Amino acid sequence: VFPEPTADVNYIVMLTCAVCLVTYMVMAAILHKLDQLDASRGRFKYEILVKTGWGRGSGTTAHVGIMLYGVDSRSGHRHLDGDRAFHRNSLDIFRIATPHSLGSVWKIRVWHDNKGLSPAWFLQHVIVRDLQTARSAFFLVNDWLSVETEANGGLLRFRRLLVAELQRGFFDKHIWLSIWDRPPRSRFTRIQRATCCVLLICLFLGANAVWYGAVGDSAYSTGHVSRLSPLSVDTVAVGLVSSVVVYPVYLAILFSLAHGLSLLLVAVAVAVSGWVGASFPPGVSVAWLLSSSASFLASFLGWEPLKVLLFLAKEEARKVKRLHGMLRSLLVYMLFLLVTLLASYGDASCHGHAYRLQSAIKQELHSRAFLAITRSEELWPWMAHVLLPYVHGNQSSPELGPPRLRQVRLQEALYPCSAAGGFSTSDYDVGWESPHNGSGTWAYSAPDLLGAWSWGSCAVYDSGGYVQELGLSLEESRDRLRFLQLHNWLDNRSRAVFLELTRYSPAVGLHAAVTLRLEFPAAGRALAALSVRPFALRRLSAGLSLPLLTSVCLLLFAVHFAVAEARTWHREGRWRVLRLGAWARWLLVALTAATALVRLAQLGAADRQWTRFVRGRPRRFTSFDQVAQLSSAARGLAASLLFLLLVKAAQQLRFVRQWSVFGKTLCRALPELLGVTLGLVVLGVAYAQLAILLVSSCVDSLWSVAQALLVLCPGTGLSTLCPAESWHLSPLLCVGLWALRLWGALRLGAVILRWRYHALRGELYRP
Amino acid sequence: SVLRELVTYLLFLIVLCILTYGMMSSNVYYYTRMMSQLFLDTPVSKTEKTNFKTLSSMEDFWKFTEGSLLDGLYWYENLLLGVPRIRQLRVRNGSCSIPQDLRDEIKECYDVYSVSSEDRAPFGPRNGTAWIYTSEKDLNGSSHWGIIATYSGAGYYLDLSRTREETAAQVASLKKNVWLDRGTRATFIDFSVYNANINLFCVVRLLVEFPATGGVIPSWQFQPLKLIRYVTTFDFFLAACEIIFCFFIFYYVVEEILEIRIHKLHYFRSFWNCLDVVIVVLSVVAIGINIYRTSNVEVLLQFLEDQNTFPNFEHLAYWQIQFNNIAAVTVFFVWIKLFKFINFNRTMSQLSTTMSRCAKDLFGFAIMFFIIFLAYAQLAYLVFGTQVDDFSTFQECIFTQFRIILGDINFAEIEEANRVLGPIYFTTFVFFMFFILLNMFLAIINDTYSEVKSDLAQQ
Amino acid sequence: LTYGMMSSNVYYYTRMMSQLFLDTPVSKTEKTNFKTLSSMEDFWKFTEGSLLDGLYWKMADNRSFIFYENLLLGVPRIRQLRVRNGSCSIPQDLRDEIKECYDVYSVSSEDRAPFGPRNGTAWIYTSEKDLNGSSHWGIIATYSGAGYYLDLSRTREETAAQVASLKKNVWLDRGTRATFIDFSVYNANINLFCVVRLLVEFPATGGVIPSWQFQPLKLIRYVTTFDFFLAACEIIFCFFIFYYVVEEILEIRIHKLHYFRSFWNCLDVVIVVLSVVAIGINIYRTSNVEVLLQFLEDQNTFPNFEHLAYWQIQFNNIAAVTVFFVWIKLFKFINFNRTMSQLSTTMSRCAKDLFGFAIMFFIIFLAYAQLAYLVFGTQVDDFSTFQECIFTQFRIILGDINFAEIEEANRVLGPIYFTTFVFFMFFILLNMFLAIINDTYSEVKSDLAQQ
Amino acid sequence: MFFIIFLAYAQLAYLVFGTQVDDFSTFQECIFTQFRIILGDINFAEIEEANRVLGPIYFTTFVFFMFFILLNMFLAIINDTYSEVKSDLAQQ
Ligand SMILES: CCCCCCCCCCCCCCCC(=O)OC[C@H](COP(=O)(O)O[C@@H]1[C@H](O)[C@@H](O)[C@@H](OP(=O)(O)O)[C@@H](O)[C@H]1O)OC(=O)CCCCCCCCCCCCCCC
């Protein structure tokens, strides 16, 4: 099978492959670090006397250790050498540097070493009662045995032989949980395990993509992918067969220079994954991802137990501990990065088509001819010219519902943006207020519960107002518009018009929410606003779409971080201030929770509104503006989360020894930069006030000296300034910042940073 | 210790901020656009596109003075406030010395405008006052300081009427008997408006300069005035703020005279005391201008109903301009004095000591920088002075050099005017400003900062 | 060699043609030109209007000299691409409200059936092989070399009739995705061909996107003595490249088997690879002028000079990059005193630290770029793609931006993005580079002075 | 060295854009355009459509190397020389 003649791109597979490769590279580097650290060197242990002089006759070079076969620590016997080096008729009394720690249970084992003559002395044990953890006992058999025969005990039957074997090898060849549980000097280099695990995960994903993309017609022909609801029937039997078919080939390498022959396999596997997995619809891609995840989980829980049945010393120990902590943090943080990338970048082609579609829609509605208006009566010919033919003409084949037009009365019509009060709520008959039989022919049409707050220029509205259906066909629409025109509809009160219909585009699969709104500050004056929000109508009821999976993963990450940080926050109690720290963690959890909540809200709103529209098509409006706004908010929150994670990635680069100076320099120079920032803010405020006071006094005859030194925000010249409705703050801030930049005044940071960097570099290499 | 001093100064600062905010939003600047656009942007007639902004001859000016002027002066919807006046200044025939090499064809010569060459003889039909000389004293006039020359207050004037039916007739009469000969060198038009729709005043001045080389150079200036009275509560708040500011500056000058009385031996060796004295002198001149305009704004309401007498209202506009320009620099200096006071922590102490210990060196290098700057400006004036229109005058050359430093270069006409020595000048100027000279300030600051940090560390 | 190729002003040759075709209004009343097409009717006005006026000039059906000097070679050809009706997926909830659907352009979705008055070659699909074409890579997508083509006439009176007949029997439906126009001119006064291509893309969402391509070529090289001099220089350059190849091969054979940690050997191999690629392209494009011979046999046909122009452009790009790197290699010899030696040592010793800081600088740069792409991407027109975001940020560094447009798109998170970007780029990132450079320069100068 | 790099960039710009921009039509015009680039007085709507690749690469690399490397090197030389001269004259 050779599918996908088209040249579309599925970003899921390439993004996951890139994340996996980067994780492999950084883990390989850190494991090479750990490799050379461990090679440079290669509480159960007590610090009491171990003198056993109750026997003799065993004078020989003997040096054996003990095995603390307990919980959280599985280490074998070690070796040591003293002054006498175990001379004749001498028993060594010393301690070993064994980092294994045992508990208060019957878990203790000691080995023996008899090189040459058999042992004759009886060394009972090391006399210790309570030194660090009291994980030893001053009593043993102390009986002679054969060569290299260690006496058993607590604090040959098969029921005791293989039971103890499941404690020293259970954390030895448990491939997933073996990078941080490797015994000293095991001939696997601790990186071939990483190589094999990355090989196998690559194979798992690759085989799943091949099955979902190429071999999908033999058994389930004519659309094999038809199931998305998780009911333990889908994606549960999918990764199992892949694991079964690619696990023996793993056993071929696990039993060498297999890394050189395995990098080629990784390359070809990722190439195939990018080749066949590119033509995946959203359901197929999420099904593939869940199948791979299920395969990994089953291998970690079902296949791993299957084959297992068959003084600076404290400084080095804490170094090892923090290295393992860094590895765990790296894995969890990179999984979070993958999740947030899949949450953010799922609609890239959608994004480009959205820009192009909104631009086309804007130019087809005469945006320039609508915003640049100054006559409030040319709007009727405008809508009868460029709106009705747009809606009902053959140019717009997809419509998705009729338009609507709702106006607010406000009930205190102004006398010729200010001087506003409350809003009308009552009903009015044909013409205006005239209740004869029942309710007004122009009813209030109470605002909907969800979807409102357009947040205009000098007002904030809602979804309520006296609506007009504008008919369905062109002929009745003209009659309705002339009726409203010459029947006193907008004549008297005229708060707002709120024209909105919809837009669909099946070629790109996007909807667009188009809104036309006029605000009337005073009678005989009008200003117009245009907004076009394109979005994809993805529903909650559609099944197991990628947004849902990414959102639930993000919520799990949020609760994980919340509990992990609150655990330390509650231990400290109060007075946990003066650092970014916990506050930064609160910011992170707030962002990663809002991202999921807004996405779920968007999905639910989309589903509810689509069902409401399907109820009656040519009957209502259904108002997809709420869905568009929720989509935009979710996109912004995801972008902010990805920004924060990328900044954290940049910060975490300090672990290179020669590159650790930049972060320290910035952190130590922060107070001086803060002082200079305060001075610059004062100077910029003074400059902005001077500039505004000089520029807002006359036309073209301002002055001669100042305008040769007067700096404004880029893109706006010296001609059009001073907007007579509101003195906006953001352009003033831009003017201040750019005048600060252009007059120098931002290179004093260089003055401070040079001194700080030169001081830091002199304390890093010289000592 | 300095808590009250800081407190008094902070109180003084908020008063200035409130006054500026009250002054920043007078809703006048919109009005001055929409009042200047009536005269300087409306075509003379339905046929031609020419307007006062783009005058180019004498015939179009004659068209303008009967038309786009009367059309916009009698019909936003401002109205008249008296009688306007038209005046001209002119030179006399035979003011030159034509070279004897070619005199058989050049019979008449008129020099550029000057007091020595000004014409005083009665020209044309001596029927009215526009055909006879009246001195500067008899017109209560002053200098104007135009574009190509400075003009006195004398000349040949004629006050127009209040009804367009007669103003058009008299301007047509002045056009018939040729009034703008070859010797005419300038022409002024002035009047005043009310615009009863919104309570706000304005005085206008329109100038047309006739160079000796042919053509016209149109110039204009619009300056509104305010007749603010007790209308709303915000006005009362602003007036109370102005009064308390007057009392506060009175107290401040009392403390200043005390300071100069007890510490008269040394008061100009510090940079801040000079700031205080310039602030107080700017404040006193600003309040003097304010009280002068407040006293003199009541005189002008006599012309609102009907008076056939030209109102001389140019000094008010001049002093309003000066008042605004003084207020701007005053508030800037007050904010800098605020910038002085931040010396609380050790970090700000180090920053302030660094900025204070490198003042003489920065001033010393300013001299070299400006020597090079003015050498380049003089080169640009001598090369592009006749062609580019951005370098036509020395101060305009300096302004263009400052704009170029801020990246507002044109380089189109610079290269067109002189294909060589123009590009050379531009490239050398950019290279030396942006890479070499402007980095000496930073070098001085950096070395001073290093010295200050080392001195404190060893202390 | 390179500046002989960049000979006397051909810029005016290109400018005359581009001004004649792109900037000429489509008709006397309308102000629309080819650069500002907005719909299909604009394209039909342009084809019957400014195109025919700019193509055919007057003096039996004689040739047309475009500026009385540029000779129109043969006939021009117009070609379009289409997609199939019902080539997408439409929801089942609207299958009675929406009837017809056309996907975006793809080789798997293109129409291949006869349509309309199926008489000539304008209404019948012709393969890429049968058209001797190739892929174009327009703005939206990479189009094919096939489609529905028509060959125009040698006179105005017949091309006008052909285009009118194409317009009556509707030739541009909603399925149209592109339209090409090709022709070539000679201008014998100098020896230089010009190959023109005009492309108009119709995106699936509506609208029109025009583009153009004017390329001068020289295909009859050996005419004057300067051409013989250039040929001799070409031979000399090939000899130099052979000598450099053999020298670097013998110096990498045994001595210094690694050979790559010098940055001058790397520059040498980069120059050699670019030079041999340029030589190969030149050999395999000049040796194939068989299209010119085919045209010269019969000059009433369409001259197929598209691949020649494409390979000329590729050769120009390679030559420009090679000249850049050869000029950069001049730093290997400017060590005649101590002042240049210490500066070169400073740069060499600061590269290792500036790379480490530039990693962080570019990570933050890309974080800002992706945030801008995700937030302002659908609205601003300057952030529509990731590369455009990077270009816009580099322009913002220069101050070449319009803050009003990025503020209107999002009144909050627009000003925050702009202000924070400017502040942190100019106050923090631009000064750490200075700190590192100054520290390393002072260190090396002091070390040399002390020793 | 600054001018060696500057002239290399000018030569590349002349060879790439020299036929279609009007700001790179001659070598001297290429040099003038570059000094004008530093001031942010460019279009980039005609550089990018003249050559979609190798045009943006040109602009990005030129901006990066002008602003982040060579300007800081000039300032470093000036700073170090000023400090050394002041220290030596003061101590002598
Ligand atoms: C999220 C939403 C997105 C929206 C847009 C949001 C935009 C946000 C853009 C971010 C750019 C990141 C830079 C690179 C980070 C790095 O590369 O590095 C970070 C570095 C981390 O430091 P680090 O991890 O390496 O190492 C430490 C180092 O060992 C010792 O500092 C330690 O302590 P010490 O021994 O000193 O006691 C300890 O701090 C360690 O953590 O720190 C630091 O704070 C960095 C300090 C920055 C300097 C700010 C100056 C504000 C001016 C006032 C501002 C007012 C300005 C506004 C005016 C408009």
CSV table of N, CA, C and O in Angstrom, one decimal, chain C residues 413-436:
chain,number,residue,atom,x,y,z
C,413,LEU,N,-2.1,42.4,25.5
C,413,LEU,CA,-1.1,41.4,25.0
C,413,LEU,C,-0.4,41.9,23.7
C,413,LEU,O,0.5,41.2,23.2
C,414,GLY,N,-0.9,43.0,23.1
C,414,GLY,CA,-0.2,43.6,22.0
C,414,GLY,C,0.8,44.6,22.5
C,414,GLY,O,2.0,44.4,22.2
C,415,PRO,N,0.4,45.6,23.2
C,415,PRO,CA,1.3,46.5,23.9
C,415,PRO,C,2.3,45.8,24.8
C,415,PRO,O,3.5,46.2,24.9
C,416,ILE,N,1.8,44.8,25.5
C,416,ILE,CA,2.7,44.1,26.4
C,416,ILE,C,3.8,43.4,25.6
C,416,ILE,O,5.0,43.5,26.0
C,417,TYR,N,3.4,42.7,24.6
C,417,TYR,CA,4.4,42.0,23.7
C,417,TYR,C,5.4,43.0,23.2
C,417,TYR,O,6.6,42.8,23.3
C,418,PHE,N,5.0,44.1,22.6
C,418,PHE,CA,5.9,45.0,21.9
C,418,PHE,C,6.8,45.7,22.9
C,418,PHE,O,8.0,45.7,22.7
C,419,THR,N,6.2,46.2,24.0
C,419,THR,CA,7.0,46.9,25.0
C,419,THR,C,8.1,46.0,25.7
C,419,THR,O,9.2,46.3,25.8
C,420,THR,N,7.6,44.8,26.1
C,420,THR,CA,8.5,43.9,26.7
C,420,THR,C,9.6,43.4,25.8
C,420,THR,O,10.8,43.3,26.2
C,421,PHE,N,9.3,43.1,24.5
C,421,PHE,CA,10.3,42.8,23.5
C,421,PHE,C,11.3,43.8,23.4
C,421,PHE,O,12.5,43.6,23.5
C,422,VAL,N,10.9,45.1,23.1
C,422,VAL,CA,11.8,46.2,22.9
C,422,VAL,C,12.7,46.4,24.1
C,422,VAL,O,14.0,46.4,24.0
C,423,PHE,N,12.1,46.4,25.3
C,423,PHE,CA,12.9,46.6,26.5
C,423,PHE,C,13.9,45.6,26.8
C,423,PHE,O,15.1,45.9,27.0
C,424,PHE,N,13.5,44.3,26.7
C,424,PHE,CA,14.4,43.2,27.1
C,424,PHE,C,15.5,43.0,26.0
C,424,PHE,O,16.6,42.5,26.2
C,425,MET,N,15.1,43.3,24.7
C,425,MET,CA,16.1,43.2,23.6
C,425,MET,C,17.2,44.3,23.7
C,425,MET,O,18.3,44.0,23.5
C,426,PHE,N,16.8,45.5,24.0
C,426,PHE,CA,17.7,46.6,24.0
C,426,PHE,C,18.4,46.8,25.3
C,426,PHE,O,19.6,47.3,25.4
C,427,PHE,N,17.8,46.5,26.4
C,427,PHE,CA,18.3,46.8,27.8
C,427,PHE,C,19.1,45.6,28.3
C,427,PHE,O,20.1,45.8,29.1
C,428,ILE,N,18.8,44.4,27.9
C,428,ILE,CA,19.4,43.2,28.6
C,428,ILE,C,20.2,42.4,27.5
C,428,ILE,O,21.4,42.2,27.7
C,429,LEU,N,19.6,42.0,26.5
C,429,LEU,CA,20.3,41.1,25.5
C,429,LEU,C,21.4,41.8,24.7
C,429,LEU,O,22.4,41.2,24.5
C,430,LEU,N,21.1,43.0,24.3
C,430,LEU,CA,22.1,43.7,23.6
C,430,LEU,C,23.4,44.1,24.4
C,430,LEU,O,24.4,44.5,23.8
C,431,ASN,N,23.3,44.0,25.7
C,431,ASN,CA,24.4,44.5,26.6
C,431,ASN,C,25.2,43.3,27.1
C,431,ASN,O,26.4,43.5,27.5
C,432,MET,N,24.6,42.1,27.2
C,432,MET,CA,25.4,40.9,27.6
C,432,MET,C,26.5,40.6,26.5
C,432,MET,O,27.6,40.2,26.8
C,433,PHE,N,26.1,40.8,25.2
C,433,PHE,CA,27.1,40.7,24.2
C,433,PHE,C,28.2,41.6,24.4
C,433,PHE,O,29.4,41.2,24.2
C,434,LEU,N,27.9,42.9,24.7
C,434,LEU,CA,29.0,43.8,24.9
C,434,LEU,C,29.8,43.4,26.1
C,434,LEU,O,31.1,43.6,26.1
C,435,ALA,N,29.2,43.0,27.2
C,435,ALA,CA,29.9,42.5,28.4
C,435,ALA,C,30.9,41.5,28.0
C,435,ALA,O,32.1,41.5,28.4
C,436,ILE,N,30.5,40.4,27.3
C,436,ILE,CA,31.4,39.3,26.9
C,436,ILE,C,32.5,39.8,26.0
C,436,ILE,O,33.7,39.5,26.2
